[PDB]
Amino acid sequence: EEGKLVIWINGDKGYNGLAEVGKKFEKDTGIKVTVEHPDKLEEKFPQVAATGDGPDIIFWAHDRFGGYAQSGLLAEITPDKAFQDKLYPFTWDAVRYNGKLIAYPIAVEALSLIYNKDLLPNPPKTWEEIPALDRELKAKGKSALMFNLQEPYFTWPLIAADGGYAFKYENGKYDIKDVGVDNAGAKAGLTFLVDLIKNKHMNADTDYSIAEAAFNKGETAMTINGPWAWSNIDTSKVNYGVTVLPTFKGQPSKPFVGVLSAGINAASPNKELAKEFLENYLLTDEGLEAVNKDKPLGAVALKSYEEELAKDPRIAATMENAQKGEIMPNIPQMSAFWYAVRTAVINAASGRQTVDEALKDAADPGYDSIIYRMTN
Amino acid sequence: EGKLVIWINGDKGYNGLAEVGKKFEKDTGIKVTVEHPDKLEEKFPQVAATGDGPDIIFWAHDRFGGYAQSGLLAEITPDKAFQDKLYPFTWDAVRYNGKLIAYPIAVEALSLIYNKDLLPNPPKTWEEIPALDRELKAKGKSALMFNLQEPYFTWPLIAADGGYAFKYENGKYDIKDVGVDNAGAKAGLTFLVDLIKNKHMNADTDYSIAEAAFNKGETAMTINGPWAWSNIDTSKVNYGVTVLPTFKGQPSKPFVGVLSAGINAASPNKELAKEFLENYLLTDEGLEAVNKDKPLGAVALKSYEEELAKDPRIAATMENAQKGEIMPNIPQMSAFWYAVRTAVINAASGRQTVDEALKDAADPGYDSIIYR
Numbered sequence: 001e002e003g004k005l006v007i008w009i010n011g012d013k014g015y016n017g018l019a020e021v022g023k024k025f026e027k028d029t030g031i032k033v034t035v036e037h038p039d040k041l042e043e044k045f046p047q048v049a050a051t052g053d054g055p056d057i058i059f060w061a062h063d064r065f066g067g068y069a070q071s072g073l074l075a076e077i078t079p080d081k082a083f084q085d086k087l088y089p090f091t092w093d094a095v096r097y098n099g100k101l102i103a104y105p106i107a108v109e110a111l112s113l114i115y116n117k118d119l120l121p122n123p124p125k126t127w128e129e130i131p132a133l134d135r136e137l138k139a140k141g142k143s144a145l146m147f148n149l150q151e152p153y154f155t156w157p158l159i160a161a162d163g164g165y166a167f168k169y170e171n172g173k174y175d176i177k178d179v180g181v182d183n184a185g186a187k188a189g190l191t192f193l194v195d196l197i198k199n200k201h202m203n204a205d206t207d208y209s210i211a212e213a214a215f216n217k218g219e220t221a222m223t224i225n226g227p228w229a230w231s232n233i234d235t236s237k238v239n240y241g242v243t244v245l246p247t248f249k250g251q252p253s254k255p256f257v258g259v260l261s262a263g264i265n266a267a268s269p270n271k272e273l274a275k276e277f278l279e280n281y282l283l284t285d286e287g288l289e290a291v292n293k294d295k296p297l298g299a300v301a302l303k304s305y306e307e308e309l310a311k312d313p314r315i316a317a318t319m320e321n322a323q324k325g326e327i328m329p330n331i332p333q334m335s336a337f338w339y340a341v342r343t344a345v346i347n348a349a350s351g352r353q354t355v356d357e358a359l360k361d362a363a364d365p366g367y368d369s370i371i372y373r374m375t376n
Numbered sequence: 377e378g379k380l381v382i383w384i385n386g387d388k389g390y391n392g393l394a395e396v397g398k399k400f401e402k403d404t405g406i407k408v409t410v411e412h413p414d415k416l417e418e419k420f421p422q423v424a425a426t427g428d429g430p431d432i433i434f435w436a437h438d439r440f441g442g443y444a445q446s447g448l449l450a451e452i453t454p455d456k457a458f459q460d461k462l463y464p465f466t467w468d469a470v471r472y473n474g475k476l477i478a479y480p481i482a483v484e485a486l487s488l489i490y491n492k493d494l495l496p497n498p499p500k501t502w503e504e505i506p507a508l509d510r511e512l513k514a515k516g517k518s519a520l521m522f523n524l525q526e527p528y529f530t531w532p533l534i535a536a537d538g539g540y541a542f543k544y545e546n547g548k549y550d551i552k553d554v555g556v557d558n559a560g561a562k563a564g565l566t567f568l569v570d571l572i573k574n575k576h577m578n579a580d581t582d583y584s585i586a587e588a589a590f591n592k593g594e595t596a597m598t599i600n601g602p603w604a605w606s607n608i609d610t611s612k613v614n615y616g617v618t619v620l621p622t623f624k625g626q627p628s629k630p631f632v633g634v635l636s637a638g639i640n641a642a643s644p645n646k647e648l649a650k651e652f653l654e655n656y657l658l659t660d661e662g663l664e665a666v667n668k669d670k671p672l673g674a675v676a677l678k679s680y681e682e683e684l685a686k687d688p689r690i691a692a693t694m695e696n697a698q699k700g701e702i703m704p705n706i707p708q709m710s711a712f713w714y715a716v717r718t719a720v721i722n723a724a725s726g727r728q729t730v731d732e733a734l735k736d737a738a739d740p741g742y743d744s745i746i747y748r
């Protein structure tokens with residue numbers, strides 16, 4: 001680590017694009033940059049950083065950074081007024097924790113409906129229509145919809161539709177005691193999805209790669225996913241639309257919005273180098289274009305680059321879905337929250353627990369929660 | 377790599393242990409370093425989870441279930457002749473999902489420790505402690521000081537009239553059935569907070585403060601374990617070790633711990649750790665070296681115990697232990713202790729009331745300390 005840069009980022013993002021950026025950096029400065037995408041980095045980072053190890057720079061959606069900052073794993077960052085002016089105000093707000101800035105914002109992510117325009121000329125406006133749709137679509141030996149049920153992020157817009165929420169957001173701060181995941185909005189959302197399963201419109205163990213291959217091979221009319229997925233759909237030549245998520249009980253799907261963000265390890269001795277890389281190389285039209293050409297970032301934080309992208313109707317649809325949803329909390333409880341809800345969705349989907357039972361556990365984990373099973 | 381590093385708590389006989397380790401070094405040339413880092417029981421899971429940390433970790437057995445569940449401990453395989461040397465109940469304390477995950481060392485329970493001169497007659501009941509504090513306060517003394525910062529020291533009183541942690545039914549702990557906010561729990565902690573509210577005890581007394589006060593002859597009574605008696609010997613106070621007081625007529629029920637040694641699952645020195653524990657530490661002279669530094673309590677090694685059981689201080693330790701309960705070793709233990717610690721400190725300081733402090737420990741929400 002002594003005079004080089006190690007960067008971690010998720011394997012669904014443009015880390016080859018990003019590596020090309022670190023080759024530029026190395027070519028100008030002589031500093032070696034290594035980009036890695038380890039499995040479950042969002043869990044490894046706080047483990048290795050707890051002992052003063054880890055990468056120099058960590059990329060994740062902003063929801064996790066509050067917890068790292070509470071744990072002291074992140075350096076405070078100082079961008080001057082000029083630098084700050086280059087990025088949207090709400091992107092900075094996403095990386096502000098106890099009044100400090102703890103990361104650089106990169107890009108705004110939200111989920112959308114992605115549909116195969118061909119076998120499905122009109123999408124649905126609602127979830128309601130999907131069992132009747134999936135049934136006529138099985139006639140051609142197809143299914144209507146496949147998406148990741150192993151990550152609760154992908155089910156969340158449905159759960160939030162009729163009023164499921166995470167922690168109530170009250171004038172200023174988030175109410176940690178007031179947890180929305182087992183209210184009747186939440187219950188109705190997920191019970192819908194479980195019925196789709198009970199009645200075989202969806203399989204309970206579909207994961208990210210199954211939904212992706214199923215979509216990209218024309219096997220299923222629809223999927224739910226973010227900007228990063230558009231690339232591989234381009235490669236497959238599937239004719240797709242990106243559009244508004246379907247409503248439920250006639251309210252809009254509400255996706256949790258993430259700000260892909262870039263933090264500097266508090267234990268790093270290359271903090272100054274990390275600052276030059278992030279500010280002068282990545283967050284430029286050409287740094288981001290390079291990542292974005294690998295896998296699309298969504299609506300970027302950099303105003304100069306976003307000007308171009310905003311003209312793409314995938315990006316406008318992404319943004320309209322982001323409009324109906326909610327910026328993720330970055331509080332330290334988020335991590336336990338996701339772990340609970342991931343288990344609760346998987347449990348109810350597989351019949352291991354009833355909807356009421358699974359979400360009650362997610363809303364109020366006792367000592368029987370997975371969160372305290374000290375599992376791995 | 378060809379080295380042994382041992383972690384043991386700062387209150388135990390770690391110099392004694394180091395004497396055992398010099399003997400191992402003398403015979404095998406393997407260097408043994410003993411350390412006692414602060415907050416060892418939290419550090420160990422964090423460093424061990426990356427693949428470093430000590431070769432050998434000592435703690436009471438309640439924590440080893442979570443370590444083992446986390447993958448951090450090598451399964452130990454003493455043969456039958458080695459097993460017959462230690463008491464069966466001490467092996468049971470280190471069994472997790474059927475496999476032995478540590479060597480047992482000693483049996484610990486809290487006793488009442490009292491100053492015989494200040495108080496030729498210690499109280500039988502928690503209830504008479506206030507009046508007796510009144511008496512002592514006029515003499516520039518106080519009845520009782522003990523660590524209020526660690527729930528371990530309060531547990532015997534929470535448990536007296538029916539507090540429990542997790543219900544134990546038909547060979548098994550039901551982690552949905554938590555007893556820490558039942559009426560027994562509330563009663564017990566309410567008594568303690570009432571003691572504090574009326575200034576018979578100060579809500580920030582910690583281990584250090586309570587030991588200095590007893591050993592300087594400032595307070596008639598403390599609540600402590602066997603490891604404490606060495607410093608009392610040195611201070612020359614004339615003390616007895618006895619039955620904890622009763623609460624609403626019931627015996628105090630201290631959690632019973634078994635000091636245990638686990639071997640890091642990630643150690644390259646696993647065979648050496650076994651030789652060290654089986655052939656040096658767990659012997660009359662190994663344990664004697666530890667014990668002479670800070671007493672272990674009633675040891676798991678039957679040959680050494682026979683000598684110790686004669687000590688009237690061990691007899692009382694075993695009496696308190698028999699009224700108490702072996703701690704669970706389930707992986708939920710770590711988070712339970714953190715919830716209860718905060719509940720006790722919060723109730724004692726007036727941050728929360730008894731009832732809501734305990735409700736939060738019985739049922740940790742996202743608002744609880746365990747999630748910050």
Ligand SMILES: OC[C@H]1O[C@H](O[C@H]2[C@H](O)[C@@H](O)[C@@H](O)O[C@@H]2CO)[C@H](O)[C@@H](O)[C@@H]1O
Nearest residue numbers: 010012061063064109151152153258338
């Ligand atoms: O499923 C819970 C998960 O949701 C979010 O993770 C997203 C991530 O934000 C996106 O960049 C993309 O990579 O997909 C992930 C879902 O698999 C939260 O950021 C994360 O903390 C949470 O665990």
Ligand SMILES: OC[C@H]1O[C@H](O[C@H]2[C@H](O)[C@@H](O)[C@@H](O)O[C@@H]2CO)[C@H](O)[C@@H](O)[C@@H]1O
Nearest residue numbers: 385387436438439484526527528633713
């Ligand atoms: O206070 C909660 C605490 O209780 C026990 O720790 C004891 C330990 O067993 C004794 O050896 C002695 O050192 O005092 C400790 C309390 O300060 C549990 O063993 C421990 O895991 C728990 O957190």
